[PDB]
């Protein structure tokens, strides 16, 4: 007859509609989210106490709704690039603790990165120093986060190629999503239509520039997708082993070499704009390339994220 008080909604609130503390049969409550930066999923938030003794929704679901963070926003919509303005890459994440590397925020508690960037520190059983909300790499003003768990892809072989160079970091606390910090969208099934050859993607990071030192400020380059055969043939020579460019990788860069990502950009998100939803999504992860960055005819190689959606949805749902 009495459902008790309702459960708190993460990134959302609860309101008694019938009255304050009215929890009896047919008592009406409303869930909601901060609709600016979160969006309710599952149901409309209207929940009624039913005869089976628990809060139940319009669709007949007895579990909470989900406040999913808004993704893919940008103020726009590294060799040879330009400085990123604030809000350009709000998903950008710096990862310290070993050497300098990067990731990309997914939701408010997950960071997509390269397995090669975080392999050494996970296997030392040390939490990752994760920072975001800042364009300057060495600034003391930043949003702090820490790793709860690190999930490296089970087909990744460290220092033995870069196939399945993908990893997920679970943040031990949720990040506050604002105009400065916003996750990147995961690609939908038809997102390959925005990733054909010669389609433009943007890589961003703090890695080496043409001057040969790490950048103090976040930089970025627009670069086009390269034909896969053209990229496989580009790396079919020593010192590279046979089969270095796999089907789980896309390549991006110029024949002339003027634009690339380098050391220190590892794990960053190579992103593409969905012109219909008007939202940026992650197409690639910064993985590898030639040792001499910006080398002509030596394209940057990126982990093909759309191949790893079932792996991503496995871990994020199950953990
Ligand atoms: N342009 C470019 N350089 C990059 C580097 C530096 C880098 O990764 N250098 C490297 C080159 C070759 C190998 C050998 C190898 C073995 C098997 N399969 C592929 C390659 C290893 C590392 C890091 C991150 C992004 C990069 N963007």
Curated annotation (Swiss-Prot):
Complete-protein stretch covered: 364 to 686 of 686
Disease implication from the record: MASP2 deficiency: A disorder that results in autoimmune manifestations, recurrent severe infections, and chronic inflammatory disease.
Peptidase S1 domain sequence ranges: 78-317
Protein purpose: Serum protease that plays an important role in the activation of the complement system via mannose-binding lectin. After activation by auto-catalytic cleavage it cleaves C2 and C4, leading to their activation and to the formation of C3 convertase.
GO BP terms: complement activation, classical pathway; complement activation, lectin pathway; proteolysis
Cysteine pairings via disulfide bonds: 3-49, 33-67, 71-185, 231-251, 262-293
Assembly mode: Homodimer; disulfide-linked. Binds MBL2. Isoform 2 binds to MASP1. Binds SERPING1. Dimerization and MBL2 binding requires calcium ions.
Tissue specificity field: Plasma.
Post-translational modification: The iron and 2-oxoglutarate dependent 3-hydroxylation of aspartate and asparagine is (R) stereospecific within EGF domains. The uncleaved zymogen is inactive towards synthetic substrates, but has sufficient activity to effect autocatalytic cleavage.
Presence of keyword Phosphoprotein: no
Name of the protein described by the UniProt record: Mannan-binding lectin serine protease 2
Gene: MASP2
Active-site annotation: 116, 165, 266
Organism from which the protein derives: Homo sapiens (Human)
GO cellular component labels: extracellular exosome; extracellular region; extracellular space
Family under the similarity heading: Belongs to the peptidase S1 family.
